[PDB]
């Protein structure tokens, strides 16, 4: 293919991600947000567990 051609001739960097889960403990997870640690106030806390 040349730099100047039709529509059906331009390169395309295609990456096909495949999310698959098995019986093994899952390791590929997503990021967990973190808020500010407020002290001396009746608030809610959500730690790891």
d(CA 36, CA 44): 12
d(CA 18, CA 28): 12
Minimum gap (Å) between residue 9 Cβ and other proteins: 45
Minimum gap (Å) between residue 29 Cβ and other proteins: 11
SS (H, E, C) 18-33: CCCCCCCCCCCCCCCC
Q: Is residue 43 a contact point for other proteins (CB under 8 A)?
A: no
Minimum gap (Å) between residue 23 Cβ and other proteins: 6
Residues that bind other proteins (CB under 8 A): 22-25, 27
């Amino acid at each position: 293919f040349q730099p100047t051609n039709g529509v059906g001739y331009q390169p395309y960097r295609v990456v096909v991600l495949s999310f698959e889960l098995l019986h093994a403990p899952a390791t590929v997870c997503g990021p967990k947000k973190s808020t500010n640690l407020v002290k001396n106030k009746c608030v809610n806390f959500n730690f790891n567990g």
